UniProtKB/Swiss-Prot annotation:
Homology family: Belongs to the class-I aminoacyl-tRNA synthetase family.
Enzyme class: ligase
Species of the source: Saccharomyces cerevisiae (strain ATCC 204508 / S288c)
Motif 'KMSKS' region: where in chain: 278-282
Modified residues (Phosphoserine): 161
Gene Ontology annotations of biological process type: glutaminyl-tRNA aminoacylation
CC terms in the record's Gene Ontology section: cytosol; mitochondrion
Gene that produces this protein: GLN4
Record's protein name: Glutamine--tRNA ligase
Range covered out of full length: 215 to 809 of 809
Origin superkingdom: Eukaryota
Other remarks on this protein: Present with 37500 molecules/cell in log phase SD medium.
Chain positions recorded as ATP binding sites: 45-47, 51-57, 242, 271-272, 279-281
Residues bound to L-glutamine: 77, 223
Length: 585
């Protein structure tokens, strides 16, 4: 019964209405508005695509609310003016939804600019802010900073009367200062040992339009100003951020107290750090721009869009996050570890098909054209709810080129050779080599065998029959096999730069693979959900029309799903992950 929500960091969280206040009477309205129910928020900046790390923030905030029958905001933190970029907003919405969560309301930090400005005047009127005209360097010097440790002291602006500050702030608003010539600073404590109390900048002059508020504003608040005040206005009961910002909790609470508003409870958890890839917008941008990957959703990347297109089930991500647990400590996870978790999840949940990447035609010389041995095969052993299907064994079929070898002295090779018969999955007898045919280039184009129907074979291989009756094979136009994008676990530390740690074989494309005809029924009945998952607390209902929900295990090959670009006419598969953890090879 124990999950991340009732133990560790989330388990130790306060109850609604039991977090400390500077002013006692403010809790009353808080409880009235919240109704004593949990209110969290997911407040991403809509200036980029979300990556795997954000899955933890999503699950933590939406999950905690859900667990307590409360609500979670989806708040676009658009505090800073930016160029229009709708794609980021919609992607964020899709990813939240993809992971199975629902915002009770969607808001923007910019929705509160009017109230934020008012509170800024309140802060000034309470003698807790001043208008400063110091340059960036003069501000650094006042903070004892090009190395730190120096003496700290106030500028002359800090002593300004309330009247002067208020007038100058209104002049900032009305465009009487150029950008940088004036800022509103919080009047905190320059003698404090904490940098977050060194008179933080609250408002800047930017003279730039805003997508939501147009040309209305010449001045904008900073994150230091907006985050706690918006949390307060939205009556957040649990403001959950990463420990990366633990130091700012002091100034977070200070600001609320200075303008006499409800003081929300900011509590910090350790973020998820994925190593073995690159997550910065600038570096991924380089990969995309220079064509190292196909785009921002390329399956080799660890953006959430990429992970979705790759075929990683959303429930696997949720389960993974829960297993790691949530505490004040960061979770530092290798790509290999994440991929192992996905692999195990897929092994528990996927239907199993016979699929041949690089097919070689096999002809059975001693079987008639009307011979048909119907092999009925469960979609997944030990999973009755997945049912079964049938595959016709005829006198013509395809096997993997890698499942035949002419080298009869290779004691490690357990498949088909001229001196060694091979078994076929769910087929009664083995097949034995008779002859082969090559083209001028020496490539094998056909193998003749006998069906040994009148000593056990070393292994049983997959096969795809040629059978017009059952429209077999299903022909796959393109199969994209993905390996590690980088050769090392720390690409950014590569001498010649991270781009030089790229793995040349990160994407291997196979053309004209062949698949058993029952793939059609697999597609039709996707997603395939085992009972254990259906009844778990991490079940995510997926869109049955999404391509990526068509996940399956290709026996002896790996785990695959349909790519975004796939169609019935031109089937395109992505390999989600290989069958097994790495070997020395
Ligand atoms: Br955060
Ligand atoms: Cl490649
Ligand atoms: Zn100053």
């Amino acid at each position: 019964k124990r999950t991340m929500f009732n133990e560790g960091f989330l388990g130790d969280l306060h109850k609604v209405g039991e977090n400390p206040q500077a002013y006692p009477e403010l809790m009353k309205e808080h409880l009235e508005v919240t109704g004593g129910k949990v209110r969290t928020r997911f407040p991403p900046e809509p200036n980029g695509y979300l990556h795997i790390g954000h899955s933890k923030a999503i699950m933590v905030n939406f999950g905690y609310a859900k667990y307590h029958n409360g609500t979670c905001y989806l708040r676009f933190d658009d505090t800073n003016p930016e160029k229009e970029a709708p794609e980021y907003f919609e992607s964020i919405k899709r990813m939240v939804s993809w992971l199975g969560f629902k915002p009770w309301k969607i808001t923007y930090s910019s929705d509160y600019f009017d109230e934020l400005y008012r509170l800024a005047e309140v802060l000034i009127k309470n003698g807790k802010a001043y208008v400063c005209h110091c340059t960036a360097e003069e501000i650094k010097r006042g903070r004892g900073i090009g190395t730190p440790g120096g003496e700290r002291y106030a500028c002359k602006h800090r002593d300004q009367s309330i009247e002067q500050n208020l007038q100058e702030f209104r002049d900032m608003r009305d465009g009487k200062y150029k950008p940088g010539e004036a800022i509103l600073r919080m009047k905190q404590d320059l003698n404090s040992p904490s940098p977050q109390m060194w008179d933080l900048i609250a408002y800047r002059v930017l003279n730039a339009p805003h997508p939501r508020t147009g040309t209305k504003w010449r001045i904008y608040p900073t994150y230091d100003f907006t985050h706690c005040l918006v949390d307060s206005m939205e009556n957040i009961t649990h403001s959950l951020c990463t420990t990366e910002f633990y130091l700012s909790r002091e100034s977070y609470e200070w600001l609320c107290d200075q303008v006499h508003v409800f003081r929300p409870a900011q509590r910090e958890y350790g973020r998820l750090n994925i190593t073995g890839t690159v997550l910065s917008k600038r570096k991924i941008a380089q990969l995309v721009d220079e064509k190292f990957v196909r785009g921002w959703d390329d399956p080799r990347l660890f953006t959430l869009e990429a992970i979705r297109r790759r075929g990683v089930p959303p429930g696997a991500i949720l389960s993974f996050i829960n297993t790691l647990g949530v505490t004040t400590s960061t979770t530092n996870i290798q790509v290999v570890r994440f991929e192992s978790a996905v692999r195990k999840y897929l092994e528990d949940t996927t239907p199993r098909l016979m699929f041949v990447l690089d097919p070689v035609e096999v002809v059975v010389d001693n079987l008639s054209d009307d011979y048909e041995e119907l092999a009925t095969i469960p979609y997944r052993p030990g999973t009755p709810e997945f049912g079964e299907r049938t595959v016709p064994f005829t006198n013509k079929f395809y096997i993997e080129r890698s499942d035949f070898s002419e080298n009869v002295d290779d004691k490690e090779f357990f498949r088909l050779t001229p001196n060694q018969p091979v078994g076929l999955i769910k087929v009664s007898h083995t097949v034995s080599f008779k002859s082969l045919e090559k083209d001028e280039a020496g490539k094998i184009i056909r193998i003749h065998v006998n069906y040994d129907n009148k000593k056990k074979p070393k292994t049983y291989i997959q096969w795809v029959p040629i059978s017009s009756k059952y429209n077999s094979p299903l022909r796959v136009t393109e199969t994209r096999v993905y390996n590690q994008l980088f050769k090392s676990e720390n690409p950014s530390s590569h001498p010649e730069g991270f781009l030089k740690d790229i793995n040349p074989e990160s994407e291997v494309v196979y053309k004209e693979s062949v698949m058993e005809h029952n793939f059609g029924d697999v597609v039709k009945n996707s997603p395939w959900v085992v009972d254990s998952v259906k009844n778990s607390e991490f079940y995510v209902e997926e869109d049955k029309d999404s391509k990526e929900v068509c996940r399956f295990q290709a026996m002896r090959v790996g785990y695959f799903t349909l790519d975004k670009e796939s169609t019935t006419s031109k089937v395109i598969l992505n390999r989600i992950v290989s069958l097994k953890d790495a070997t020395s090879k």
